[PDB]
Write a protein that binds this ligand. Structure first.
Ligand SMILES: CN[C@H]1CC[C@H](N(Cc2cccc(-c3ccncc3)c2)C(=O)c2sc3ccccc3c2Cl)CC1
Ligand SMILES: CC(C)CCC[C@@H](C)[C@H]1CC[C@H]2[C@@H]3CC=C4C[C@@H](O)CC[C@]4(C)[C@H]3CC[C@]12C
Ligand SMILES: CCCCCCCC/C=C\CCCCCCCCOC(=O)[C@H](O)CO
Ligand SMILES: *[C@@H]1O[C@H](CO)[C@@H](O)[C@H](O)[C@H]1NC(C)=O
Ligand code: NA
Ligand code: NA
Length: 593
């Protein structure tokens, strides 16, 4: 109807000093600085407008704030009545201009109070066209897809090429990834090729574990080398709009990111559980030294179950929560790149676990080796003490010599009685055999104490038979069980520890990244906000000053993690660097020629 009394306020009009409000020419000629609390002059108002216009970055917000700001700072005043802006004009900004309520809060007069912004006002800014759609400041890029938007800023996503690192740093990390990826690709393939060439003999535990291990590092390397194909890095890492890929799998985008993610992460996680299977193979290889062999072939089902099933669960679980993200420096897609907390439970947890489990089996194995190796050495020493003191008693002129050699024999026999090979019926006869001998040394000692040297020496000759009838039989068994330890057994443990070291390095890199990522994100937001904040409230004078990023991820750490990941692949590929396999390839060349 004709203008509602509540949709306007009694204020003295002054003619306009600017024909234009934020780019757009105005349909009236008089204004009032009543509606703007912060402004008392028109010139002051205009300067405030120049501060608001730092929201040009944030288009989604800019597009609704422009009309609201005119309606407040440059409102129409006609015949001592100023036109108030409608509620629906003010509320429309609350959503997309949420960065305002975060960074400084909305001023009193821009909060959608019913008194200040009445209901159903014909605003008059609706007749003004605000042509400015708005742009995104570096490192954001303009996009209308809401899945690409960076937090409170809407309309802007992070550029595909990692803003935290220069182009120089990218090609350098890519050179590094190329070197390690390719070499590991060649090493693992060569090593896989030798297994399939001699498949009949190769596919047998524990040597076959290293085949599956090398398979994982081979499949993983493909995923890592993908990016170096012409235009692939951009297809895997960048979105259609030109922002980074984040939160995959997302609906309209291609599968190239999730493909590369599955290739790398599944292969990585399977390789870690195959490593634990290697450390278990090594721990149980010593328990075979017992009467029951306990075959690895029987446990093959349990291995193939865990090694393929567990990565599948983790991969599926990741795909379900949709945490696949791309990175231009690494050139692959992975879990938890953006959301670092998911990287904890899907990368740091499993590696933490394979460290504890694999490490347990590695420690528990060397404990078995060193314990076995010392128990024989100790028995050997006691047995050698017995034989040396028997010679002394044989040669003895007198009782003092005999008593001395016998007390030493006694001590060695009691000590040897304590030893165990690595209430048992075998142990009963072992401990009893020494009980007999100690009791015979006992008898011989009495003769020696009484002075009967020839009697004592005669008694000592019976210890020789007692020794041969029991203790000899068992000492030979102890020697044979430690001889059973082949070089392929120990070589497996050497590889286990060599792999464990790399795992421990990888873990520490991820741990380091996890610990410092939160600051790296904070440092980015502060840099983003700085770019908009520094363009306003600054004199025109010299060029606007560039901002900085406090902190970022360490490329040395990334290069260390890469050396550890690919280094394991290379080290594990040296399992076939033997005489035997040089024969298998030379067998083939003659065949062909
Ligand atoms: C295992 N080694 C990791 C270390 C961390 C590396 N890393 C994490 C990452 C990657 C990609 C995207 C995001 C991300 C996107 C949106 N909001 C917050 C973060 C984070 C980054 O290099 C970047 S890029 C970026 C952009 C903005 C804010 C911080 C930020 C960071 Cl830190 C990857 C390799
Ligand atoms: C990612 C980027 C675009 C977000 C940053 C937008 C910046 C420029 C925004 C956020 C909060 C805004 C401020 C909100 C309130 C006021 C008080 C007013 O009396 C003068 C302008 C001033 C001081 C604004 C200037 C512009 C401002 C600082
Ligand atoms: C055959 C595979 C095994 C069984 C099925 C696995 C899960 C299937 C569901 C996948 C979800 C995929 C996209 C749909 C919305 C998921 C929101 C994601 O929200 C998230 C939750 O926090 C998840 O816990
Ligand atoms: C701005 O408006 C003019 C007409 O006044 C038009 O030619 C132009 O395309 C508009 N600009 C944008 C970015 O839409
Ligand atoms: Na005022
Ligand atoms: Na997808």
């Amino acid at each position: 109807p004709p203008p509602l009394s509540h949709c306007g306020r009694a204020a003295p009009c002054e003619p306009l000093r600017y024909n234009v409000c934020l780019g757009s020419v105005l349909p009236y000629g008089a204004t009032s600085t009543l509606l703007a609390g912060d402004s008392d002059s028109q010139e002051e108002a205009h300067g405030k407008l120049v501060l608001w216009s730092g929201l040009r970055n944030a288009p989604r917000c800019w597009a609704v704030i422009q009309p609201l700001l005119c309606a407040v700072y440059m409102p129409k005043c006609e015949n001592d009545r100023v036109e108030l802006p409608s509620r629906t004009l003010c509320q429309a900004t609350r959503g997309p201009c949420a960065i305002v309520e975060r960074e400084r809060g909305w001023p009193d007069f821009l909060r959608c109070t019913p008194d200040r912004f009445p209901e159903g006002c014909t605003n008059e800014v609706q007749n003004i066209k605000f042509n400015s759609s708005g742009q995104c400041e570096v490192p954001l890029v303009r996009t209308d897809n809401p899945k690409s938007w960076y937090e409170d800023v809407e309309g802007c996503g992070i550029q595909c090429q990692n803003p935290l690192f220069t182009e120089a740093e990218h090609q350098d990390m890519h050179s590094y990834i190329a070197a390690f990826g390719a070499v590991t690709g060649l090493c693992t393939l060569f090593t896989l090729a030798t297994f399939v060439a001699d498949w009949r003999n190769s596919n047998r535990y524990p040597a076959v574990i290293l085949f599956y291990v090398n398979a994982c590092f081979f499949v993983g390397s493909i995923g890592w080398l993908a990016q170096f194909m012409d235009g692939a890095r951009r297809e895997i890492v960048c979105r259609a709009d030109g922002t980074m890929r984040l939160g995959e799998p997302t609906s309209n985008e291609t599968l190239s990111c999730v493909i590369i993610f599955v290739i790398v992460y599944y292969a990585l996680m399977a390789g870690f559980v195959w490593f634990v299977v290697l450390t278990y193979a090594w721990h149980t290889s010593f328990k075979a030294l017992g009467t029951t062999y306990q075959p690895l072939s029987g446990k093959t089902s349990y291995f193939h179950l865990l090694t393929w099933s567990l990565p599948f669960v983790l991969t599926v679980a990741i795909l379900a929560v949709a945490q696949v993200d791309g990175d231009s420096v690494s050139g692959i897609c992975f879990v938890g790149y953006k959301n670092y907390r998911y990287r904890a439970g899907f990368v740091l947890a499993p590696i933490g676990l394979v460290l504890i489990v694999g490490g347990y089996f590695l420690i528990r194995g060397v404990m078995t080796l060193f314990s076995a190796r010392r128990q024989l050495a100790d028995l050997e020493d006691n047995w050698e003490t017995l034989n040396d003191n028997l010679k002394v008693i044989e040669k003895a002129d007198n009782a003092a010599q005999v008593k001395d050699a016998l007390t030493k024999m006694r001590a060695a026999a009691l000590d040897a009685q304590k030893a165990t090979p690595p209430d048992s019926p075998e142990m009963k006869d072992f401990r009893h055999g020494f009980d007999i001998l100690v009791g015979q040394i006992d008898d011989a000692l009495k003769l020696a104490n009484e002075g009967k040297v020839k009697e004592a020496q005669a008694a000592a000759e019976q210890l020789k038979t007692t020794r041969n009838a029991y203790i000899q039989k068992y000492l030979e068994r102890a020697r044979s069980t430690l001889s059973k330890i082949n070089e392929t057994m120990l070589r497996l443990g050497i590889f286990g520890f060599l792999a464990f070291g790399f795992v421990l390095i990888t873990f520490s890199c991820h741990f380091y990244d996890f610990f410092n990522q939160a600051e790296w994100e904070r440092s980015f937001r502060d840099y983003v906000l700085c770019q908009a904040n520094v363009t306003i409230g600054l004199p025109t004078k010299q060029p606007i000053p560039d901002c900085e990023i406090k902190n970022r991820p360490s490329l040395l750490v990334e290069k260390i993690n890469l050396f550890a990941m690919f280094g394991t692949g290379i080290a594990m590929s040296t399992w076939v660097w033997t005489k035997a396999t040089l024969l298998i390839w030379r067998r083939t060349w003659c065949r062909l020629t």
